[PDB]
Amino acid sequence: WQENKSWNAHFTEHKSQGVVVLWNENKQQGFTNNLKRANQAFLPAGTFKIPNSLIALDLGVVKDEHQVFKWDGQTRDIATWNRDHNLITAMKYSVVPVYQEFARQIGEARMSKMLHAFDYGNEDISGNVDSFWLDGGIRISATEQISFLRKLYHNKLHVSERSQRIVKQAMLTEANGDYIIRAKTGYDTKIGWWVGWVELDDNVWFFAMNMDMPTSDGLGLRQAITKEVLKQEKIIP
Amino acid sequence: WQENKSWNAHFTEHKSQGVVVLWNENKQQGFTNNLKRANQAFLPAGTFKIPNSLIALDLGVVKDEHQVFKWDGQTRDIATWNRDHNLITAMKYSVVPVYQEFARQIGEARMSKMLHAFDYGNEDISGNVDSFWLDGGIRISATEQISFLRKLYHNKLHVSERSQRIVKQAMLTEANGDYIIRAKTGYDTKIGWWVGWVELDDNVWFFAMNMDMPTSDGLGLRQAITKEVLKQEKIIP
Ligand SMILES: [Cl-]
After folding, report:
1. Hey, are the CB atoms on B169 and A169 less than 8 Å from each other?
2. CATH of range B1-237; options 3.10.150.10, 3.40.1440.60, 3.40.710.10, 3.40.50.920
3. Which of A162, A175, A202 sits opposite B172 (nearest CB)?
């Protein structure tokens, strides 16, 4: 690990504070603007959708990325959530209710063993089985996110290869002639996250970032700041 | 099928001639600017990489999208081809030599049965086993491309689901918050192709286009014209 405090300007430029962590797969070297925050554990919030999805797929709770998860009929504040979804759209719109259902079907016991097998965060699911990642005991650091993602990238997680490929499909966020980004955002009403990786022709750059988000105002900076960092490091144009 | 001659302006705007074929999956309705050219069969050229890849994966010729295909040491005119590649980069750069090797390893017999099982084009592989798609007897129409792609999308082709998912990964071309495009280009030194699909939140639009390409000058119009059509039909913004 190498600390690059210069990356801090990206946060200050935006009257914000946080951490960005990068991992160069080819070189097995990591970078961050704050070695400490890089290791501060936080509630994963939406980013937990990645493991929740893997678990659901492996247990059959989710058949594939096409399967329809019919809306339960309860209108919620976020418009996009009040409709039928599939893994793809459920990830894109961060549809909590769908995932809460997955969690319930998964159940405490299977969830707990699964997170342990994944070596995910503090592996604690205390609280409601269908809300622990949002207001429970589970906590994960950015470096931890990276360790987890690297396993996923390489299909080394303790679930079927198929489940892993499907989740990676569902993580698709951006792609063009220069790179591909597979990631997941999160927001716990205090902290905002963006975790994933940038696929290049001959390398992969894993990333995990989090930042203070007192207001849903700046959710956009999660992606904005990260890219400024990627651009700065010449990972993307 | 519905014929929309208005789409012809897109070709004429560019001093070109060709065909664009669209298929609305949800509605099971197709559209094109020229019902006849839509059915004219042509050499698939690079677009054949899709089936070649599937076959290679299913037979073990290709392990996964990570496996390295070491350059044979013969310098070819196209710069990007003179290096080691993987399925991802091999598709992106349309690396003929890699695919020729796959074909040889696959062999005539297995190739022939595989294309028949796929119901691919005229299913004829006459010519060199490692060049038939470029200067041999195989021919496929745009509507035929679509039929083939629909099977792929739905994992209904006669190969493993895994092989199909991997190829679809390798077809990734573009993605953003509004759509995802999975496709493959082709060029036989007279005809240029772009085939694939546009994934939306609640629908999929398959597409296949081909156009006269006397010169490698206008290869760019394959994607340009198609998008103008997609935009026109309000499929993409
Ligand atoms: Cl993908």
Report:
1. yes
2. 3.40.710.10
3. A175
